[PDB]
């Protein structure tokens, strides 16, 4: 069946922790073969495990990126959820942080069918070393 | 033009302030005519200012509602954004809270076309009165 709300909470949290450790195969395996990622929402879609893996591989290589939930996963009873988080990464040498909310829809196999990630440069800040 | 990312942040914050004071006429004037709301997401959508007013009236019916952003509004360049917040309400004489995320899309006059609010019982707090 579609994941329960509790299962969505588990899955969406797991997705962030996998980014945090840079586990590309684990990240990719959570997605449907032909999933669609919009990140940032508004930009053209990334489609399918091959392109999604390249997106994360390029983003996470190599390899001073961290990612943290910054609040509870909000989960529905129809296999969807949304979560707030912060990504830490290097743009231009300067340590930076990006606040993001991801919305996910899961299929009946428990895989991510769609992900939208909302953020723009208003959500980007410099960090203290 | 659609609202800029910055304008989206301001609009979505204003939506929370209006819920916090329970000003339904102001809440509803932020929505475009025939706007669609799904709250909680997974329930049937409702649409239009009448239905949306009635929805907010149902959610405000217990009296002492407050609403707080619990992090920054995330905004796109295509008139969309997403925000984390907490509503506090009194339900059956007890102080309760819900953690929610709302996603909104705005039209080119800065009114809301669609809203989706994510939450369920996994996002509830219910405590003793004191």
CB contact under 8 A, A118 and B72: no
Cα nearest neighbour of B104 on chain A? A118
Q: Do A101 and B118 touch (CB under 8 A)?
A: no
Contact B74 A121 (CB under 8 A): no
Say yes or no: A11 contacts chain B, CB-CB below 8 A. no
Structural resolution in Å? 1.5
Cα B14 versus chain centre, distance = 10
In three-state secondary structure terms, A107 is: coil
Contacts of A79 (CB under 8 A, 6+ apart): A2, A3, A8, A105, A106, A107, A108
- Kindly determine whether residue A75 and residue B6, on different chains, have CB atoms separated by under 8 Å: no
Distance set, CA A21 to CA A62, A63, B27 (Å)? 11, 9, 42
Burial class (CB in 10 A: 0-12, 13-18, 19+), B59: middle
Cβ neighbour number for residue A34 with a 10 Å cutoff:
11
**Residue from the list B5, B78, B119 with its beta carbon closest to the beta carbon of A74:** B119
Cβ atoms of A81 and B126 closer than 8 Å: no
Q: Which domains does chain B have, with CATH numbers?
A: 1-130 (3.10.450.50)
């Amino acid at each position: 069946n579609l994941p329960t709300a509790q299962e969505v909470q588990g899955l969406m949290a797991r997705a962030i922790e996998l980014v945090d450790v840079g586990d590309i195969e684990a990240i990719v395996q959570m997605y449907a073969d032909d999933a669609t990622v919009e990140d940032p929402f508004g930009q053209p879609p990334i489609h399918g495990r091959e392109q999604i893996a390249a997106f994360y591989r390029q983003g996470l290589g190599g390899g001073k990126v961290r990612a943290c939930l910054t609040g509870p996963v909000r989960a529905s009873h129809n296999g969807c959820g949304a979560m707030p988080f912060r990504v830490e990464m290097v743009w231009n040498g300067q340590p930076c942080a990006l606040d993001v909310i991801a919305v996910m829809r899961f299929d009946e196999h428990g895989r991510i069918q769609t992900m939208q990630a909302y953020w723009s440069e208003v959500n980007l800040s410099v960090r203290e070393p």
